Design a binder for this molecule. Structure first.
Ligand SMILES: O=c1ccn([C@@H]2O[C@H](COP(=O)(O)OP(=O)(O)O)[C@@H](O)[C@H]2O)c(=O)[nH]1
Ligand SMILES: O=c1c(O)c(-c2ccc(O)cc2)oc2cc(O)cc(O)c12
Length: 427
């Protein structure tokens, strides 16, 4: 009756958090949850009651593994400088067939060795893995393996190219070029995955193939129903929000009894490392007639806050969101779902990857506005705030999606499929 279930994910807290959500549902049904991740997440993993396994304890001498979270800013600073200078079209021309995350693929060999040893030792009944791309170990281990996807799922559909930020209102002419450039760089990803798979003598699969079951996490009302169905074996979970740390969130006395709406500002787990980005956003908000709670990121201690702002490096985002009126976000999927669950509209300033797809989805479906870094001004950000605060149509759309997310029973089907696959080893 009781299953051994092993989770893993890449370093990004977004990938871990999505998995923690599914791990909760499965623990409530009486299964033993294991989580293979990095020592900086042992505390949260063990607090949710999962057994913690360190990726670092299973490293191969010739393939060392490092947690890239303390040094992701270098990568995120490059994305910022480019997105600040270039339009999304100009950025794709420049990329010259270079894919957004093909550079990570060669570096994956170490984690792959580690997971082969970990799945052999712990002999689980099923594995789940939130990665940006399939990894050889998922096809060599005895048990079935369910890819979990927490990024924007447009990549699972035949439609606008992914990582591009295309609109449903975009004319065929503007879209023909971006489509062409994206197809060119998608094959750079395939060629890099070929080398990684060849390294382990495993036949190459599509980067987002699900052999039996795949779980993508996106709200039904935002899912791409106008493009048809996702790829085979891929099933939607409307949300995967981890257990709240504190149920009640005490507001800081600085922003209490002060004039204006209450606005949350975070640029995520990764982009938040770029102090120049937060500084660009916060400087003009000094003279926005409202109150800001700011996630300042790993370098937050060196970021100036003004009289209408309170902030810490890390914020309890899930506890906070119910108390705010508006969320200024980077376009991360967990932040999107956390925000819409709380019923808050979004101003999305996308930085890299699926964030552009999520930002354009927020715009296209009347759940907030997209603000591009190339066009960014204090004038346009302050107007975006006033427009979205006062737009009854947007605030109605968000409330509607909020209700669809609370009432969702998508979790019921998804739990059954995980249990069926784990016990039957097929669907
Ligand atoms: O101060 C903070 C900043 C972020 N987060 C969490 O970090 C995740 C960010 O995921 P998302 O996909 O939105 O961003 P990304 O991982 O792409 O940066 C979400 O679960 C947030 O709740 C948090 O708890 N506190
Ligand atoms: O290009 C990259 C990228 O897009 C991402 C990413 C992480 C989490 C997401 O949710 C979405 C994207 O991580 C990276 C990590 C690296 O060490 C190097 C990279 O080049 C990327």
């Amino acid at each position: 009756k009781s299953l051994k279930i092993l989770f893993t994910a890449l370093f990004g807290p977004g990938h871990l958090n999505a998995c923690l959500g599914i791990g909760s549902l499965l623990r409530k049904r009486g299964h033993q949850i294991y989580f293979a991740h990095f020592p900086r997440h042992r505390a949260t993993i063990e607090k949710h009651g999962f057994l913690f396994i360190s990726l670092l304890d299973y490293a191969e001498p010739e393939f060392p593994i490092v947690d890239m979270l303390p040094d992701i800013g270098i990568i995120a600073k490059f994305a910022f400088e480019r997105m600040h200078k270039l339009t999304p079209l100009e950025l794709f021309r420049h990329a010259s067939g270079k894919h957004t995350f093909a550079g990570m693929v060669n570096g994956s060999k170490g984690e792959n060795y580690a997971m082969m040893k970990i799945v052999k030792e712990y002999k689980p009944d099923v594995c789940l893995a939130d990665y940006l791309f399939n990894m050889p170990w998922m096809f060599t281990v005895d048990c079935p393996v369910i890819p979990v996807k927490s990024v924007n799922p447009i990549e699972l559909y035949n439609g606008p190219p992914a990582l591009t930020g295309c609109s449903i209102h975009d004319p065929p002419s503007v879209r023909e070029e971006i489509e062409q450039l994206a197809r060119k760089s998608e094959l750079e990803l395939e060629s890099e995955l070929e080398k990684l798979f060849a390294h382990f003598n495993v036949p190459l699969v599509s980067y987002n193939y699900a052999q039996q079951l795949g779980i993508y996490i996106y709200p039904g009302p935002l899912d791409y129903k106008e493009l048809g169905s996702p790829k085979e074996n891929w099933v939607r979970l409307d949300s995967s929000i981890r257990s709240t740390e504190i149920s009640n969130f005490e507001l800081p006395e600085k922003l209490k009894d002060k004039p204006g709406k209450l606005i949350y500002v975070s640029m995520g787990s990764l982009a938040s490392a770029v102090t120049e980005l937060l500084t660009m956003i916060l400087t003009p908000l000094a003279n926005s007639p409202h109150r800001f709670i700011v996630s300042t990121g790993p370098n937050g201690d060196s970021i100036k806050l003004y009289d209408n702002m309170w902030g810490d490096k890390f914020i309890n985002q899930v506890a906070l969101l119910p108390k705010v009126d508006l969320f200024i976000t980077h376009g991360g999927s967990n932040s999107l779902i956390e925000g819409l669950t709380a019923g808050k509209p979004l101003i999305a300033i996308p930085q890299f990857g699926d964030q552009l797809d999520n930002a354009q989805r927020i715009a296209d479906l009347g759940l907030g506005v997209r603000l591009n870094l190339h066009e960014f001004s204090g004038e346009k950000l302050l107007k975006a705030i006033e427009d979205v605060l006062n737009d009854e149509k947007i605030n109605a759309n968000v409330a509607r999606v909020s209700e669809e997310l609370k009432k969702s029973d998508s979790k019921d089907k998804v739990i059954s499929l995980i249990e069926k696959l784990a016990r039957d080893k097929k669907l």
